[PDB]
Design an enzyme around this catalytic site. Structure first.
Site, short mmCIF file in Angstrom:
data_model
loop_
_atom_site.label_atom_id
_atom_site.label_comp_id
_atom_site.label_asym_id
_atom_site.label_seq_id
_atom_site.Cartn_x
_atom_site.Cartn_y
_atom_site.Cartn_z
N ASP A 67 0.84 -1.19 0.00
CA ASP A 67 0.00 0.00 0.00
C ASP A 67 0.88 1.24 0.00
OD1 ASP A 67 -2.18 -1.76 0.18
OD2 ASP A 67 -2.12 -1.71 2.37
N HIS A 69 -0.54 4.56 -1.42
CA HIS A 69 -1.44 5.70 -1.22
C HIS A 69 -0.91 6.96 -1.91
CE1 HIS A 69 -3.97 3.41 1.46
NE2 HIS A 69 -2.92 3.08 2.20
N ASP A 96 -5.21 0.41 -3.09
CA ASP A 96 -5.19 1.46 -2.07
C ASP A 96 -4.39 2.68 -2.51
OD1 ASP A 96 -6.62 -0.41 -0.61
OD2 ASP A 96 -4.84 -1.14 0.44
N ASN A 128 -9.85 -1.55 -2.73
CA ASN A 128 -11.11 -1.34 -2.03
C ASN A 128 -11.34 0.11 -1.64
OD1 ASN A 128 -9.16 -1.19 -0.08
ND2 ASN A 128 -9.95 -2.86 1.19
N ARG A 225 -19.13 -3.61 11.17
CA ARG A 225 -20.14 -2.85 10.45
C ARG A 225 -21.55 -3.39 10.64
NH1 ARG A 225 -17.15 0.06 6.20
NH2 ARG A 225 -15.04 -0.83 6.09
N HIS A 252 -2.91 -4.12 3.70
CA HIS A 252 -4.19 -3.60 4.20
C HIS A 252 -4.48 -4.09 5.62
CE1 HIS A 252 -7.56 -1.04 3.46
NE2 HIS A 252 -8.46 -1.98 3.70
#
EC number: 3.1.3.16
Length: 309
Positions: A67, A69, A96, A128, A225, A252
């Site tokens: 990752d 970014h 990502d 994602n 969630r 991640h």
């Protein structure tokens, strides 16, 4: 006047070196260049499916990264130190790329430029965080509007709508970011027969494909969630045995040391996101795979402070 120039529809080494120095001057490219680059990536990607069979020999080496970014300065440092990119050195990034990144748009457009340079040697899989659901509400859409206009935004969205999901390499490596469904019976065909150039889904098992990740502990942990949850290790071990995979190295998941061997030791997680949100400042690393070295090769680099721009 330093206006744009297209040469035989081919992006050449000197030209994007000139583009790199232009971006070090930190100016804005003219919109027609955006028009042709966007259309060209549109046709070149729209013909590409979720799974494309690419075979890499033991004499070829492949570079994979965690990752990032949108660390554009670090990418420039890679080009500067690790050497000029080559046909025999493909680069792959594990999603990502965006969100919490203030100039990841320049990163992604120069990635499309490199795709124009190498249309069969640079491949990526949908992450994602590259979803309009969180990008529209939680400020990424505001970043896009501050940068540019809405028509180009929907152009990037429709380009992203063809992003692939899973890849196979060497017949020994299977590549994806998220993972599997919560139930058995998962084939490549069912995903393959799903038409993906449509309205992106809010959630569900198709969201589980790119968000559901295994856990180092065994058992079945409910998703915080309130919808679905991370499936158990029996499914993972069954799929590992069936799809003749030894192990995989992905990201991640947050590790203090920057890397870890977890899931009963059957998976490797690497953290190559140095000082994400100016928090951890951990070491980063990228992995070279080739036939001459059966064990994965690790190059560990560290980031530097960046101007508050």
């Amino acid at each position: 006047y330093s206006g744009p120039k297209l040469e035989d529809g081919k992006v050449t080494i000197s030209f994007m070196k000139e583009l790199m120095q232009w971006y070090k001057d930190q100016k804005k490219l003219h919109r027609k260049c955006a028009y042709q680059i966007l259309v060209q990536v549109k046709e070149v990607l729209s013909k590409l499916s979720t799974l494309v069979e690419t075979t890499l020999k033991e004499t070829e080496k492949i570079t994979v990264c965690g990752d990032t970014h949108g660390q554009f300065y670090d990418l420039l440092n890679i080009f500067e130190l690790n050497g000029l990119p080559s046909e025999t050195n493909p680069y792959i990034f594990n999603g990502d790329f965006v969100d919490r990144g203030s100039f990841s748009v320049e990163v992604i457009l120069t990635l499309f430029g490199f795709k124009l340079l190498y249309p069969d040697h640079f491949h990526l899989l949908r992450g994602n965080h590259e979803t309009d659901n969180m990008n529209q509400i939680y400020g990424f859409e505001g970043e896009v509007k501050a940068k540019y206009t809405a028509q180009m935004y929907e152009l990037f969205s429709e380009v992203f709508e063809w992003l692939p999901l899973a890849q196979c390499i060497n017949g020994k490596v299977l590549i994806m970011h998220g993972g599997l469904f919560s139930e058995d019976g998962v084939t490549l065909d069912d995903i393959r027969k799903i038409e993906r150039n449509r309205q992106p889904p809010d959630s569900g098992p198709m969201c589980d494909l790119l968000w559901s990740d295994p856990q180092p502990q065994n058992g079945r942990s409910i998703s915080k969630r309130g919808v679905s949850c991370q499936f158990g290790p029996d499914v993972t071990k069954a799929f590992l045995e069936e799809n003749n995979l030894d192990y995989i190295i992905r990201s991640h998941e947050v590790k203090a040391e920057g890397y870890e061997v977890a899931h009963g030791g059957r998976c490797v997680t690497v953290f190559s996101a140095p000082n994400y949100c100016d928090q951890m400042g951990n070491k980063a690393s990228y992995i070279h795979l080739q036939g001459s070295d059966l064990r994965p090769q690790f190059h560990q680099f560290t980031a530097v402070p960046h101007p508050n721009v």
